[PDB]
Amino acid sequence: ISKEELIKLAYSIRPRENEYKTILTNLDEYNKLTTNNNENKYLQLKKLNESIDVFMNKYKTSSRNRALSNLKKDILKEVILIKNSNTSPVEKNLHFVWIGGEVSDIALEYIKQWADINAEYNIKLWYDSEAFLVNTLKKAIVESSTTEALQLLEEEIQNPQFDNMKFYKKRMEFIYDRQKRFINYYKSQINKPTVPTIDDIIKSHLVSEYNRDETVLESYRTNSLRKINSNHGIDIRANSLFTEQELLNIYSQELLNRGNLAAASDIVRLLALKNFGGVYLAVAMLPGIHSDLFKTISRPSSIGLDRWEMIKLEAIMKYKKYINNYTSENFDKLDQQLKDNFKLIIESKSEKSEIFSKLENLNVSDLEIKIAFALGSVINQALISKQGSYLTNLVIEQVKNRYQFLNQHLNPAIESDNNFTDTTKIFHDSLFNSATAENSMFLTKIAPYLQVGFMPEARSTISLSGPGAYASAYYDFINLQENTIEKTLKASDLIEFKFPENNLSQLTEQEINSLWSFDQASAKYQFEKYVRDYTGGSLSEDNGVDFNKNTALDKNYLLNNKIPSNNVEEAGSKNYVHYIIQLQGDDISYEATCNLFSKNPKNSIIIQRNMNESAKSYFLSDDGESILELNKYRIPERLKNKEKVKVTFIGHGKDEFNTSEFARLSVDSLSNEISSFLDTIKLDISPKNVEVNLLGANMFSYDFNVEETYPGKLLLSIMDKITSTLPDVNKNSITIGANQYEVRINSEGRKELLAHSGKWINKEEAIMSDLSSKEYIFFDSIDNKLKAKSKNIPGLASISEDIKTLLLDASVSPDTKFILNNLKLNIESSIGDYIYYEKLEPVKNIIHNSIDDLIDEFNLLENVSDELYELKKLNNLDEKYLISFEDISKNNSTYSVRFINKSNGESVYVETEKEIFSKYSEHITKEISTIKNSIITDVNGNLLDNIQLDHTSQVNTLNAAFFIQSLIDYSSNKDVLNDLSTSVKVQLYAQLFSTGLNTIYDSIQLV
Amino acid sequence: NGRNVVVEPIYNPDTGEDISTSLDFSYEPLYGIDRYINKVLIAPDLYTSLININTNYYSNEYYPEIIVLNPNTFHKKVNINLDSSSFEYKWSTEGSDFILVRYLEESNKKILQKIRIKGILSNTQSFNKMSIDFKDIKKLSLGYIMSNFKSFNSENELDRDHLGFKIIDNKTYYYDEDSKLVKGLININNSLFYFDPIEFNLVTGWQTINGKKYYFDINTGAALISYKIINGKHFYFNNDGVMQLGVFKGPDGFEYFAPANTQNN
């Protein structure tokens, strides 16, 4: 805000230019156009920012660009100041969406709970009157395609080394063929003068292409309508939600062309919030809990925050239930006094009056919307908006732009009537030939658009109409741009736009059930369920020779046949020991331990826990060709100095999604096993960082919710044991990790995989997916939940390059070419996600820390300069006044600072209650006393310097010299008004030469 | 600060004059004193949209790595202009910075020129700002480099911050104050030590430095000083540690320390 202070602050030798005059006139229009209306003021500020941007783009080496960048930062503060003006509550509404099917009883109970707690809020449920059988049609299409592909792949089902992705590709091909037939039948019934309905067309297609009954489908349409109409249902076709033909086409292509009900629900959410101002909650949401009624119960350290919140919800809805099937398995863990305390503290209160909070005041601006959060990223669960909200219009414009881009690059492949493989090859060739430097990640994300919800690892709605669109529109609103595709958001701006936690309360059993995504493990277990349901005689592959085979270590085979044939090498540090543990007596884990010993033939030991009495440690000596049978699981003297340990457990797991067992043990049993092993480590190794691996079948790594997984609870127990027993290992120096397959390079150079049959199979796409999907989960140092480690980006690049070479190879089937192309797209999207989500940590060393220290010092300098400028503006002191920093004499409440005029030297006093100008004055007094004793004496104005040859006496003087020199030399922002440079120059001159400025008081000698 | 070179644009005295928008670096002023310099920190300013790094100066012996700081300019794209070919580069990532390595072999001399762009992978604004120019190709991007160029594992670099004798392998080092990894013939407390100037590790046994002969102990590494018995023979050194040829006095008496090719050879 500077109407006339912008001039004589940015001076150039050239005269005033036309763009500078336009900037001055638009700024004057902004300052003289003041009103309580915010939209016109926002548009005026956006025009001012665009004028400043086009002037700085046209004229590069101009001297006004520094002051204009400072004005741009002031504009970015002013947009928040503009948004925080209209503090008005939102009009009282609730919106819920359920499209195409019966409303579930659990979601019905949730929305009745929301209506019961919030009686004054008029709830609504949005639904489509003509769309009621799309879920059953999609299920029938999926089952028919599953039968069609599985009849073709039945001769390859019997192979235990079968790959699932080719079957998923065949099922996706049949699904796309059925969808093409259905959309041809739907577009064949538009030219008639009479009008049909969508449910009638779906019913006709069902009874024509299946054994469906017309009366049964009519009954299913009729009973579903009355349930919704009783449960506060309002139709989306009766109201004027569907206005623009582009949005009609978007809804039609995301409902009828693609069975993507959540994507249809996204445009339904935006249109409902644009038409009727209200507060949107998802159907798996619960009202908030007061923190005061549960703060008397101390939270244990072995239970995560999300686990504690969901067992709090289970404790509330366990006794006073209100839910038919609310599972409280995590609540049923052993805490008798905590369970009794929860029982008394929820039975000592009333019924639904103080347990759950109220929504009586939601004060938001007209421009602002608020959104829920999930692991540092936004999520479309809870929304608050008024009617006709500007940023909601921005979100629907971003959705329109993204869908226009996708339709423009997809409609040639839609009109080119071919099969699925050729259609998606045409789509990929159309997408990748228009990939600029600004939307490469966007096109890589929306590249597998046709197979969303059917093939594993296909997430496109997040970039199309979900949290990516929301974050892009938030960036677009904050930074005053137009149609940003993919750019990051600051965490400060996100928590400034944050939804209230006591109004959201995301954590729900249905939310946890919906939080799982169609990943590799989900696809494998769904395939196993499909095979077990189609064939009555299931194949048991886990039997083998697994039990009653206590195979000893063949030392001659280990020494003469495996270590000289080690064709693989690693490029990592070797200050670690590999505590390889075998937990089952079978040839598969025997060969796995032998191959890991081939990976590390120097530092690794072998422990076989399949038998108890003959269990020891086997390793090479200082010389080669010598294996020691040393007992007590000990190590040589050469391994007693490593700062890292890498334990590894090799076994088996039963076919269960989120398997709770490994090698026929449990989480607590394996924690006690690692503790009993650690009782022998403690006399040898005092490390700095530990590392736990997990190799074996049916052991995956999950990324959405790391709690409730097998490495999560095991990770919590082991980190408790590490932070209790082992010294010099911090809480954040923990690492769990799970891997499925085993990697070996033979003499040819190919990567080999080991299966249950005992032979070696070149399952290249499976081993590349496993290597690209292995993660590490650690405990973060901000006292938060468990987080996932950053992957090896050069390793992912090497896997992508190997995929590129195998796709450029000649003797490769097109199905495996398609699978490897999809895997390359997934790896590129993963690297783009690490760049986009700010998941990459900064490095910490002596060189890097000083740069951040100077950056923080410059930021503090700018803050002190801005606060001094507003103090000089408020107290009406002109440019000839110099602040003293040695006189910070204060009252009991306020801080008094004095000023010295440069013309006659009077000492006025002003009062301002600010913590700044006290600690900063202390800092600039300490960094002047740091160089004061670096001077021995002054002779006739010449200062005799004293040099210190000690290193620790040179860093302090250099740091003080940098700190004084930066803020005595740098022209700060708005420094023509306040002269902090000469204000500290006078203090430095006084302290160096004379008695200090706190003692000098005579006006003539002061001048 | 650790003997780090801070390349910086020149502050303009005249306020109204146009500000230059280019930075240049060359290895030419580091000739002779590159054996003392730790790293080079190029620090761009608000008016900086072009960086020229002349990497062709081959007459140096030690090449410090270059750490390019993250700028906050108003420019849409800032340009890095290396005068070298598109090949002989391997890229990496250590946390949130971009590592570029020039490894070329010539004249039986190994040159490893390493360039690091600090704080460039933190967000897409800094990721899409950089555009790197080479001799044969120009106007690239970091995503293009990640897609096309070969990648290598830079996490093998074990030489992190330390302060004393580190026995991190079979070899051993010094890691002096401000973690500079001294590499010559140095004295640390009172005794002379020798660290091999091409692999930075401490070497023992017989050594020859510019013709003169020193001896370093196998057990410790210090230079031997007095009349000492080595393998049944007799040798005399001065306080500087170099052997002397002549007549000098031991505890058993005076002796004669002859040069090679004598009556006994």
Q: Which 3-state string (H, E, C) describes A230-276?
A: HCCEEECCCCCCCCCHHHHHHHHHHHHHCCCHHHHHHHHHHHHHHHC
Asked if residue A951 lies in contact with residue B177, where contact means CB atoms within 8 angstroms, the answer is yes
Q: Which residues on B lie below 8 Å from A486 (Cβ)?
A: 124
Asked if residue A453 lies in contact with residue A179, where contact means CB atoms within 8 angstroms, the answer is no
Mapped onto helix, strand or coil, the DSSP state of residue A95 is: strand
- In A, minimum Cα distance to B146 occurs at A797
Q: In degrees rounded to 5, what are phi and psi of residue B142?
A: -65, -35
Secondary element (H or E) of residue A307 = helix A305-319
- Picking from B98, B147, B172, B180 by the largest number of A CB atoms within 10 A of its own CB, the best residue to mutate is B147
- In A, minimum Cα distance to B168 occurs at A575
State how far the Cα of A982 lies from the Cα of A807, in Å rounded to an integer.
Answer: 67
Q: Which residues on A lie below 8 Å from B15 (Cβ)?
A: 11, 63, 971
Is B150 close to A801, i.e. CB distance below 8 A? yes
Return the bridge partners of B110, or none. Answer: B105
Nearest neighbour of A847 by CB, restricted to B4, B95, B151: B4
Q: Which residues on B lie below 8 Å from A841 (Cβ)?
A: 95-96
Strand order across the beta sheet in which A751-754 lies: A743-745, A751-754, A760-761
Taking the CA atoms of chain A, what radius of gyration do you get in angstroms?
A: 34
- In A, minimum Cα distance to B127 occurs at A835
List C-alpha distances in Å: B42 to A504, A991, B34, B117.
Answer: 47, 34, 16, 10
Asked if residue A441 lies in contact with residue A829, where contact means CB atoms within 8 angstroms, the answer is yes
State how far the Cα of B188 lies from the Cα of A556, in Å rounded to an integer.
Answer: 49
B251 to chain A nearest CA, in Å? Answer: 39
Is A831 close to B146, i.e. CB distance below 8 A? yes
Asked if residue A900 lies in contact with residue A885, where contact means CB atoms within 8 angstroms, the answer is no
Asked if residue A269 lies in contact with residue A280, where contact means CB atoms within 8 angstroms, the answer is yes
Q: For residue A571, with 0-12 CB atoms within 10 Å meaning exposed, 13-18 middle and 19 or more buried, which class applies?
A: exposed
**C-alpha torsion angle, residues A100, A101, A102, A104 (rounded to 10):** -90
Q: Tokens 């690239």, residue?
A: B140
Q: How many CB atoms lie within 10 A of CB A292?
A: 8
Return the bridge partners of A629, or none. Answer: A618
Is B143 close to A440, i.e. CB distance below 8 A? yes
Q: Which tokens belong to A280?
A: 């949107």
Closest CA to B181 of B100, B62, B43: B62
Strands B4-7 and B39-42: parallel
Nearest neighbour of A572 by CB, restricted to B91, B156, B169: B156
State how far the Cα of A575 lies from the Cα of A644, in Å rounded to an integer.
Answer: 6
Q: Which tokens belong to B210?
A: 């510019």
**Among positive and negative, which fits the CA dihedral A592, A595, A600, A602?**
positive
Q: Which residues on A lie below 8 Å from B70 (Cβ)?
A: none
Asked if residue A566 lies in contact with residue A577, where contact means CB atoms within 8 angstroms, the answer is no
Query: Distance between terminal CA atoms of chain B?
Result: 54
- Picking from A51, A54, A55, A63 by the largest number of B CB atoms within 10 A of its own CB, the best residue to mutate is A63
The count of C-alpha atoms lying within 13 angstroms of the C-alpha of A1001, restricted to the half-sphere facing its C-beta, is 5
A572 to chain B nearest CA, in Å? Answer: 5
Nearest neighbour of A840 by CB, restricted to B47, B95, B178: B95
DSSP H helical ranges for A775-878: 793-808, 814-836, 846-874
Q: For residue B187, with 0-12 CB atoms within 10 Å meaning exposed, 13-18 middle and 19 or more buried, which class applies?
A: exposed
Q: Which tokens belong to B27?
A: 């290895």
Closest CA to A835 of A442, A402, A318, A383: A442
Closest CA to A449 of A172, A131, A859, A70: A172
B105 to chain A nearest CA, in Å? Answer: 21
Q: For residue A492, with 0-12 CB atoms within 10 Å meaning exposed, 13-18 middle and 19 or more buried, which class applies?
A: exposed
State how far the Cα of A882 lies from the Cα of A986, in Å rounded to an integer.
Answer: 9
List C-alpha distances in Å: A672 to A300, A652, A666, A681, A718.
Answer: 19, 19, 10, 14, 9
A13 to chain B nearest CA, in Å? Answer: 5
Amino acid letter, residue B138: K
Q: For residue A896, with 0-12 CB atoms within 10 Å meaning exposed, 13-18 middle and 19 or more buried, which class applies?
A: middle
- Max Cα separation, chain B? 83
| DSSP designation for B155 | G
State how far the Cα of A452 lies from the Cα of A450, in Å rounded to an integer.
Answer: 6
Asked if residue B36 lies in contact with residue B1, where contact means CB atoms within 8 angstroms, the answer is no
Q: Which tokens belong to A883?
A: 């602040």
Alpha carbon of residue A12 to chain centroid = 46
The count of C-alpha atoms lying within 13 angstroms of the C-alpha of A861, restricted to the half-sphere facing its C-beta, is 25
- Max Cα separation, chain A? 111
B95 to chain A nearest CA, in Å? Answer: 6
Is A65 close to B121, i.e. CB distance below 8 A? no
List C-alpha distances in Å: A833 to A443, A579, B86, B244.
Answer: 13, 33, 27, 67
- In A, minimum Cα distance to B19 occurs at A61
Long-range contacts of B257-265 (CB under 8 A, 24+ apart): none
What is the CA angle A100-A216-A226, rounded to 5? Answer: 50
Q: Which tokens belong to B188?
A: 């640390």
Contacts of A786 (CB under 8 A, 6+ apart): A304, A706, A707, A712, A715, A716, A777, A778, A779, A780
Asked if residue A299 lies in contact with residue A308, where contact means CB atoms within 8 angstroms, the answer is yes
Contacts of B175 (CB under 8 A, 6+ apart): B161, B162, B163, B164, B165, B166, B181
Amino acid letter, residue A546: D
State how far the Cα of A130 lies from the Cα of A328, in Å rounded to an integer.
Answer: 38
Q: Does A838 touch chain B (CB under 8 A)?
A: yes
Secondary element (H or E) of residue A471 = helix A467-478
Nearest neighbour of A951 by CB, restricted to B38, B169, B178: B178
Q: Tokens 């017309």, residue?
A: A214
Asked if residue B57 lies in contact with residue B106, where contact means CB atoms within 8 angstroms, the answer is no
Q: Tokens 């604004």, residue?
A: B125
Closest CA to A329 of A297, A300, A299, A307: A307
A555 to chain B nearest CA, in Å? Answer: 27
State how far the Cα of A441 lies from the Cα of A472, in Å rounded to an integer.
Answer: 13
A693-711 as b/e, with b when 16 or more CB fall inside 10 Å? bbbbbbbbbbeebbbbbbb
Q: How many CB atoms lie within 10 A of CB A322?
A: 13
State how far the Cα of B58 lies from the Cα of A274, in Å rounded to an integer.
Answer: 66
Secondary element (H or E) of residue A88 = strand A88-89
What is the CA angle A884-A998-A906, rounded to 5? Answer: 60
Asked if residue A504 lies in contact with residue A288, where contact means CB atoms within 8 angstroms, the answer is yes
Nearest neighbour of A63 by CB, restricted to B19, B49, B92: B19
Taking the CA atoms of chain B, what radius of gyration do you get in angstroms?
A: 25
Return the bridge partners of A649, or none. Answer: A581, A694
State how far the Cα of A990 lies from the Cα of A1007, in Å rounded to an integer.
Answer: 12
Technique used by the depositors: cryo-EM
Give the per-residue SS3 of A202-235.
HHHHHHHHCCCCHHHHHHHHHHHHHHHHHCCEEE
Query: Distance between terminal CA atoms of chain A?
Result: 33
Is B168 close to A836, i.e. CB distance below 8 A? no
Return the bridge partners of B254, or none. Answer: B249
Q: Is A662 left (phi over 0), alpha (psi -120 to 50) or beta?
A: beta
Mapped onto helix, strand or coil, the DSSP state of residue A739 is: strand
Q: Tokens 């500000």, residue?
A: B19
State how far the Cα of A941 lies from the Cα of A133, in Å rounded to an integer.
Answer: 94
Closest CA to A829 of A476, A463, A472, A453: A463
Nearest neighbour of B95 by CB, restricted to A828, A842, A951: A842
Q: Does A563 touch chain B (CB under 8 A)?
A: no
Asked if residue B44 lies in contact with residue B23, where contact means CB atoms within 8 angstroms, the answer is yes
Q: Does A62 touch chain B (CB under 8 A)?
A: yes
Is A61 close to B19, i.e. CB distance below 8 A? yes
Mapped onto helix, strand or coil, the DSSP state of residue B240 is: coil
Q: Which residues on B lie below 8 Å from A831 (Cβ)?
A: 146
Closest CA to A604 of A568, A642, A632, A571: A642
Asked if residue B103 lies in contact with residue B53, where contact means CB atoms within 8 angstroms, the answer is no
In this complex, how many residue pairs, one in chain A and one in chain B, have their CB atoms less than 8 Å apart?
122
Q: In degrees rounded to 5, what are phi and psi of residue A252?
A: -65, -40
Q: Which tokens belong to A86?
A: 């209209």
Closest CA to A187 of A18, A415, A34, A22: A415
Is A61 close to B146, i.e. CB distance below 8 A? no
| DSSP designation for A791 | P
Is B161 close to A845, i.e. CB distance below 8 A? yes
The count of C-alpha atoms lying within 13 angstroms of the C-alpha of A788, restricted to the half-sphere facing its C-beta, is 21
State how far the Cα of B196 lies from the Cα of B175, in Å rounded to an integer.
Answer: 14
**C-alpha torsion angle, residues B138, B142, B147, B149 (rounded to 10):** 60
Q: Does A849 touch chain B (CB under 8 A)?
A: no
State how far the Cα of A246 lies from the Cα of A397, in Å rounded to an integer.
Answer: 11
Asked if residue A133 lies in contact with residue A257, where contact means CB atoms within 8 angstroms, the answer is no
State how far the Cα of B200 lies from the Cα of B139, in Å rounded to an integer.
Answer: 38
- Picking from B21, B78, B116, B124 by the largest number of A CB atoms within 10 A of its own CB, the best residue to mutate is B124
A465 to chain B nearest CA, in Å? Answer: 20
Mapped onto helix, strand or coil, the DSSP state of residue A817 is: helix
Is A840 close to B122, i.e. CB distance below 8 A? yes
Give the per-residue SS3 of A11-68.
CCCCCCCHHHHHHHHHHHHHHHCCCCCCHHHHHHHHHHHHHHHHHHHHCCCCCCHHHH
Q: Rounded to the nearest 10 degrees, what angle do helices A198-209 and A134-152 cross at? A: 30
State how far the Cα of A77 lies from the Cα of A65, in Å rounded to an integer.
Answer: 18
- Picking from B92, B120, B123 by the largest number of A CB atoms within 10 A of its own CB, the best residue to mutate is B123
Q: Does A12 touch chain B (CB under 8 A)?
A: yes
Enter the resolution in angstroms.
Answer: 3.2
State how far the Cα of B192 lies from the Cα of B177, in Å rounded to an integer.
Answer: 17
Q: Which tokens belong to B79?
A: 């340009």
What is the CA angle A716-A720-A723, rounded to 5? Answer: 135
Q: Read out DSSP for A343-386?
A: HHHHHSS-SSSSSB------EE-SS--EEEEETTEEEEEEEEE-
Nearest neighbour of B127 by CB, restricted to A66, A792, A835: A835
Q: In degrees rounded to 5, what are phi and psi of residue A355?
A: -70, -45
| DSSP designation for B249 | E
Q: In degrees rounded to 5, what are phi and psi of residue A664?
A: 55, 40
Nearest neighbour of B123 by CB, restricted to A11, A488, A971: A488
Is A65 close to B74, i.e. CB distance below 8 A? yes
State how far the Cα of A323 lies from the Cα of A833, in Å rounded to an integer.
Answer: 38
| DSSP designation for A638 | G
Amino acid letter, residue A694: L
Q: In degrees rounded to 5, what are phi and psi of residue A667?
A: -70, -50
B64 to chain A nearest CA, in Å? Answer: 13
List C-alpha distances in Å: A539 to A156, A280, A522, A528, A741.
Answer: 13, 48, 19, 10, 20
Q: How many CB atoms lie within 10 A of CB A137?
A: 23
Is B153 close to A795, i.e. CB distance below 8 A? yes
Contacts of B107 (CB under 8 A, 6+ apart): none
Amino acid letter, residue A781: S
State how far the Cα of B64 lies from the Cα of B150, in Å rounded to an integer.
Answer: 22
Closest CA to B161 of B244, B57, B38: B38
Q: Which residues on B lie below 8 Å from A848 (Cβ)?
A: 118
**B-proximal residues of A, 909-968, CB under 8 Å:** 951, 955, 958
- In A, minimum Cα distance to B118 occurs at A848
